[PDB]
């Protein structure tokens with residue numbers, strides 16, 4: 429229902445103006461953190477592990493697929509996408525097919541955001557420094 | 568469990584029976600029964616080996632001693648007809664190797680010319696070929712194969728026939744889903760790929776449990792209506808439905824088939840896949 | 853009374869896990885073995901036994917009615 433109601437870029441931009449993008453980014457970060465704090469538990473396998481994560485990432489990709497929102501929110505989404513992708517790469521035992529699809533979508537979004545003016549890029553590099561500040565493999 | 572009931576592949580050496588099991592089993596005891604015992608060559612030592620390697624065919628392990636773990640060595644007295652091998656800890660095994668490692672061989676006068684099994688002519692022990700009919704006196708009585716290296720092997724290396732005894736194996740074990748031990752990143756990658764495939768299978772079957780969910784939701788609604796739909800005598804009578812069972816509410820029977828049959832089969836498949844996935848995750852961790 | 857008692861036990865809505873036929877009891881397909889035991893007993897008692905007895909009684913009643921009509 430939600431994706432059907434915002435199929436027009438008109439309402440995607442409206443929601444982005446209201447601040448939906450930071451909300452979905454924070455939700456993705458919280459879900460990935462829950463998965464990270466969950467791999468310390470047993471190897472309990474859950475069939476629907478990552479449906480919320482995959483759906484939130486799909487929503488973020490749908491919003492980013494509009495040029496203006498991408499322009500205005502690249503610098504604000506690069507940090508959260510980097511953090512999410514790095515934290516998802518740590519997953520080994522709890523890595524589910526849906527988690528793999530989410531990580532691939534985050535990689536595609538990050539690559540889509542790396543592209544930009546040298547300024548925007550150097551700004552994204554500054555973000556990368558903060559992400560590394562936030563382990564010999566993940567950095 | 569009779570070992571014969573869970574073997575899916577078997578190969579032999581002159582002293583070893585190497586077997587692939589239908590699946591991984593946790594084994595606590597092995598009993599060996601010995602029938603038709605001949606006094607000329609009697610087993611003195613049995614070694615039991617195992618591994619939990621997944622193989623397509625047991626021949627891949629036949630001549631690979633470094634791939635086997637020794638579970639137990641047992642000694643027999645001359646003419647012993649039953650051996651109980653109590654393992655100090657249960658072993659998890661998808662393959663077994665039983666080795667007859669030493670013998671109380673009774674020496675005899677092999678110098679005497681042997682008798683041809685086909686024409687009864689006298690045959691010299693070397694080369695052991697009948698000069699009258701060409702029959703080889705050292706051929707396996709069961710499969711006619713000739714061992715080149717050993718003229719009097721304890722087992723036929725082709726078919727496992729033993730002229731000195733018959734061996735029956737009874738495994739006090741239980742079926743236990745398990746995977747091959749992970750060694751190096753090569754096996755780590757294999758295990759990860761297996762985990763991914765099994766998770767895909769688990770996702771597919773989940774859907775089956777959930778596919779029957781709306782059907783059960785619906786049949787339950789109809790059954791709650793408690794309508795006295797008059798008995799419908801369908802022309803098709805392939806199913807053996809007795810009058811009383813035929814008169815049972817169709818939805819009730821439909822519910823019983825959907826849940827106890829279909830939902831239970833799907834849930835059993837899903838639980839087996841989940842247990843195997845948990846074992847793979849535990850090994851990887 | 854037998855059907856009454858079966859109805860009373862059924863309305864208990866009690867789950868009694870299918871009792872394994874330790875003895876040589878009549879073979880029951882698992883599909884049907886998972887119904888309630890009281891449901892199957894009721895179906896046999898009423899649709900089988902009560903129906904057979906009622907059919908016999910109705911045949912006897914019709915023959916008695918024919919005999920009474922002829923006598924009258």
Ligand SMILES: [Zn+2]
Pocket residue numbers: 683684685686687688697698699700701702
């Ligand atoms: Zn001959």
Ligand SMILES: [Zn+2]
Pocket residue numbers: 707708709710711712723724725726727728
């Ligand atoms: Zn042979």
